[PDB]
């Protein structure tokens, strides 16, 4: 019942005793740094109250306001992965599936993780331990999305180019690999709309000029080998002004 300001000093208060000035900022440290233990029923009430304001505040971009390209059923959205209403959206996710630790790191897995809320980290980890191991690269995993306004998360590995090195054609095909099984798993969901970020580009250091034109093929060869699944709309999420030029320039050329 409190108001969203006082939610989350709450939830600060609830965070600290057990165990960067705007207060989501300190809140969202807290719940990134938090290995993925039980939680509070306490502690889960406030949050989604928190992520039910959050989502009162916003009208959530829908696939029709995505901007059209040269292909068919390939759709471009420049903005934050957290406002788009799809079916689902990819997470460029680390092996554990946890989510990210590191206090409000600029990576999707902690926006994802932030703002679908704790419930997302505790799920992973029900899921991880039935599996008993880590993720391997260019899988594909669906989960709820809890407070985004996407249906479900499909997390995906994606693979680290060590710094200074070139994009090997097997380098090239593990990323092609987790498009490849997201859209694989989109249908098998049943879905008819997938938003990919920019996997492997950030933290993992994947040239983002290679990884867009590898993203478009492997997209396009999936298309054209899986007639079945035309019903399927795809939309490239970019983030970065380089990645909005880059996919530009491949899907929407004049
Ligand atoms: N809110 C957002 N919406 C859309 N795209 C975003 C957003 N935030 C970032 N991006 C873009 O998302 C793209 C991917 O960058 P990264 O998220 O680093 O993913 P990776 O596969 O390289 O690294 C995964 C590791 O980093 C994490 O800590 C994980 O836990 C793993 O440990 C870039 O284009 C970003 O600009
Ligand atoms: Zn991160």
Same mark, same amino acid.
């Given at each position: 019942?409190?108001?969203?300001?006082?939610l989350l000093?709450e939830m600060?208060?609830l965070?600290?005793?057990?165990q960067?000035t705007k207060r989501?900022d300190?809140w @969202?440290?807290?719940?990134n740094?938090?290995?993925?233990?039980?939680?509070?029923?306490?502690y889960l009430?406030?949050?989604?109250?928190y992520?039910d304001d959050?989502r009162?505040?916003?009208?959530?971009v829908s696939?029709?306001?995505?901007?059209?390209?040269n292909?068919?059923?390939?759709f471009l959205?420049?903005?934050d992965? @957290?406002?788009?209403?799809?079916?689902?959206?990819?997470?460029?996710?680390?092996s554990?599936?946890?989510?990210?630790?590191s206090?409000?790191?600029?990576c999707i897995?902690?926006?994802?993780?932030?703002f679908a809320? /704790?419930?997302?980290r505790?799920?992973?980890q029900?899921?991880?331990?039935?599996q008993g191991?880590?993720?391997?690269?260019?899988?594909?995993?669906?989960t709820s999305?809890?407070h985004?306004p996407? /249906?479900?998360?499909?997390?995906?590995?994606?693979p @680290?180019?060590?710094?200074?090195?070139?994009?090997s054609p097997?380098?090239?095909?593990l990323?092609?690999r987790?498009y490849?099984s997201?859209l694989d798993?989109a249908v098998?969901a049943?879905?008819?709309?997938?938003?990919f970020?920019?996997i492997?580009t950030?933290?993992?250091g994947?040239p983002k000029?290679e990884?867009a034109?590898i993203?478009?093929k492997?997209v396009?060869?999936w298309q054209?080998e899986?007639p079945e699944?035309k019903?399927l709309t795809?939309?490239f999420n970019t983030?970065?002004?380089?990645?909005?030029?880059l996919?530009?320039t491949?899907?929407?050329?004049?």
């Amino acid at each position: 019942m409190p108001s969203s300001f006082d939610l989350l000093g709450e939830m600060i208060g609830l965070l600290q005793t057990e165990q960067l000035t705007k207060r989501q900022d300190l809140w @969202r440290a807290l719940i990134n740094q938090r290995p993925a233990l039980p939680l509070s029923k306490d502690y889960l009430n406030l949050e989604d109250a928190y992520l039910d304001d959050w989502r009162a505040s916003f009208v959530p971009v829908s696939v029709k306001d995505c901007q059209k390209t040269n292909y068919t059923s390939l759709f471009l959205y420049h903005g934050d992965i @957290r406002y788009l209403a799809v079916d689902a959206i990819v997470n460029a996710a680390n092996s554990e599936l946890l989510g990210c630790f590191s206090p409000n790191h600029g990576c999707i897995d902690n926006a994802i993780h932030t703002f679908a809320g /704790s419930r997302l980290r505790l799920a992973c980890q029900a899921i991880m331990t039935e599996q008993g191991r880590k993720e391997a690269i260019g899988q594909a995993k669906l989960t709820s999305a809890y407070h985004l306004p996407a /249906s479900y998360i499909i997390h995906t590995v994606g693979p @680290r180019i060590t710094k200074g090195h070139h994009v090997s054609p097997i380098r090239a095909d593990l990323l092609a690999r987790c498009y490849r099984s997201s859209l694989d798993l989109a249908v098998k969901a049943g879905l008819t709309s997938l938003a990919f970020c920019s996997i492997s580009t950030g933290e993992f250091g994947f040239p983002k000029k290679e990884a867009a034109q590898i993203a478009i093929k492997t997209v396009l060869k999936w298309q054209a080998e899986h007639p079945e699944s035309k019903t399927l709309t795809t939309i490239f999420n970019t983030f970065t002004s380089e990645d909005k030029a880059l996919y530009d320039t491949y899907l929407q050329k004049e």
